[PDB]
Amino acid sequence: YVKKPSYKIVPHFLGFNIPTVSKWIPIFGIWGAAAGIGALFLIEGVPRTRQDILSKIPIIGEHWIREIPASDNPF
């Protein structure tokens, strides 16, 4: 014979609890990647982005190492 139902209240705040949020953690991860790729893509033209980030990527990085010949440069 069972006298009482067996349960606990999980901690929660603003209607979020850990079991639910934990299911969404990977989704925040992917959104973060999306935002990172997006942001980096938006500033790919910025010379500092090329110098500091993009040209350092192995193999691929030579795409962003481009020199104007001194003969063709007024400045």
Binding site: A70, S71, D72, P74
Partner: protein, 55 residues
């Protein structure tokens, strides 16, 4: 190559009567001439500087 030759016609014929006021020496560089050729054209001329120390 035609642009370069056309510059030479401007310089030797048209420039006696016609200006080309909107073109700077830097504009020719990497189009018709190298940096050095264009600097040489510029350096042969005299332009107004800022006044000296006595004004």
């Amino acid at each position: 190559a035609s642009l370069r030759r056309g510059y030479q016609v401007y310089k030797e014929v048209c420039a006696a009567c016609h200006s080309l006021d909107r073109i700077a020496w830097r504009n020719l560089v990497g189009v018709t001439h190298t940096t050095d050729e264009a600097k040489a054209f510029a350096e042969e001329l005299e332009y107004d500087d800022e006044p000296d120390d006595e004004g």
